[PDB]
Write an enzyme that holds these catalytic residues in place. Structure first.
Site, mmCIF file in Angstrom:
data_model
loop_
_atom_site.group_PDB
_atom_site.id
_atom_site.type_symbol
_atom_site.label_atom_id
_atom_site.label_comp_id
_atom_site.label_asym_id
_atom_site.label_seq_id
_atom_site.Cartn_x
_atom_site.Cartn_y
_atom_site.Cartn_z
ATOM 1 N N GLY A 29 -13.883 12.298 25.062
ATOM 2 C CA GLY A 29 -14.814 11.178 25.260
ATOM 3 C C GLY A 29 -16.207 11.632 25.703
ATOM 4 N N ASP A 142 -3.215 22.648 17.315
ATOM 5 C CA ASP A 142 -4.600 22.358 17.114
ATOM 6 C C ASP A 142 -5.556 23.053 18.087
ATOM 7 O OD1 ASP A 142 -6.324 21.042 15.328
ATOM 8 O OD2 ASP A 142 -6.683 19.494 16.837
#
Ligand SMILES: CO[C@H]1CC[C@H](C(=O)Nc2cc(-c3ccnc(Nc4ccc(F)cc4)c3)ccn2)CC1
Length: 335
Positions: A29, A142
């Site tokens: 974020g 990832d």
């Protein structure tokens, strides 16, 4: 006497406890840097904005909060504080995660010239961390530079816990969805290592199509038996892709790119290439494991049984309406 205050950080509204002071924009974020006056140390603060706002934001948040609160290793993130300004489940909007601050993100590090003690050390730490997650059945899948951070003294941490948007570092088995084991994070590690040498993203791809074109266009078409593990439709796409024998590792990572004036430097430069040549192998059945990569003479100068073999840390991802999450996340923030 309400414990919170509000400021603008970069752009968005941060409402944080009074202890965190002098907030500075570092990420989006939306993350920022602050002095934590209680602890007297520097901190990174992450704003999660209405994280129950959808199944994607929600699962990621719930996963990363349970996970953050039971993993305890020097190379994965240590969460220092979780809080919500909102008083009630009714009014609940944002979650603020707080951890201690490092000097650099791994993208800035990739951009410089690393000597081998340092490069070798980072990759070691990456493996220790990766080794921790795997022992709690966590397969990351990832790893990427933007989610690794680093201290001036060269200590490394991994920030996130991965797949349940940068796709360059994802393994073949991920790109074509085929079923993985722990060494799927070895691809990603080797893509990071590869980028440290080359100072270029190894496989810069628009999409999973463009990316795959770029993998094979260098490492070559995977052999017969790898393809024989792909699901009939995906196997068929992959099989009618233009073939490539692809460059060998000396040709992929030439001598031009290496510190090679000292004899030490020369000896290590070929040890890196060896190690890379073992990590960046498409077929997972042929690609080095996290335990072998630590016994490699490039890494093993750092081997530490305390670090490498740390005591391992309900079952996650499940379907909830964007109301059942609000409550699930809120309960986790209140502990
Ligand atoms: C201008 O900035 C300078 C100073 C330091 C700067 C820097 O980025 N330092 C730095 C950054 C982070 C960071 C970066 C991106 N995302 C998160 N997420 C996060 C997850 C969990 C959590 F609890 C908190 C946050 C944390 C952590 C530690 N240190 C690099 C350069």
């Amino acid at each position: 006497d309400n414990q919170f205050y509000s400021v603008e950080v970069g752009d968005s509204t941060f409402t944080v406890l009074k202890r965190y002071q002098n907030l500075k924009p570092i990420g989006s974020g939306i993350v920022c840097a602050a002095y934590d006056a209680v602890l007297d140390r520097n901190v990174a603060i992450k704003k999660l904005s209405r994280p129950f706002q959808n199944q994607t934001h929600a699962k990621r948040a719930y996963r990363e909060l349970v996970l953050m609160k039971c993993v305890n290793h020097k190379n994965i993130i240590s969460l220092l504080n979780v809080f919500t300004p909102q008083k009630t489940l009714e009014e609940f909007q944002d979650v603020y995660l707080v951890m201690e601050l490092m000097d650099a993100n791994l993208c800035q590090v990739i951009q410089m010239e690393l000597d081998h003690e340092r490069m070798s050390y980072l990759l070691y730490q990456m493996l220790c961390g990766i080794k921790h997650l795997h022992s709690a059945g966590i397969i990351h899948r990832d790893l990427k530079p933007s989610n690794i951070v680093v201290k001036s003294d060269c200590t490394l941490k991994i920030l996130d816990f991965g797949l349940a948007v940068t796709r360059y570092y994802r393994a073949p088995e991920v790109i074509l969805g085929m079923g993985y084991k722990e060494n799927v994070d070895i691809w990603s590690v080797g893509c990071i290592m590869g980028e440290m040498v080359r100072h270029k993203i190894l496989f810069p791809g628009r999409d999973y199509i463009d990316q795959w074109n770029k993998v094979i266009e260098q490492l070559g078409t995977p052999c017969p038996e790898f393809m024989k593990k792909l699901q009939p439709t995906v196997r068929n796409y992959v099989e009618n892709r233009p073939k490539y024998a692809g460059l060998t590792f000396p040709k992929l990572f030439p001598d031009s790119l290496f510190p090679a004036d000292s004899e030490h430097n020369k000896l290590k430069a070929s040890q890196a290439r060896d190690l890379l040549s073992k990590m960046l192998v498409i077929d997972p059945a042929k690609r080095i494991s996290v335990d072998d990569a630590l016994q490699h003479p490039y890494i093993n100068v750092w081997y530490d049984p305390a670090e490498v073999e740390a005591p391992p840390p309900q079952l996650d991802e499940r379907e909830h309406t964007i109301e059942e999450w609000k409550e699930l996340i809120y309960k986790e923030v209140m502990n």
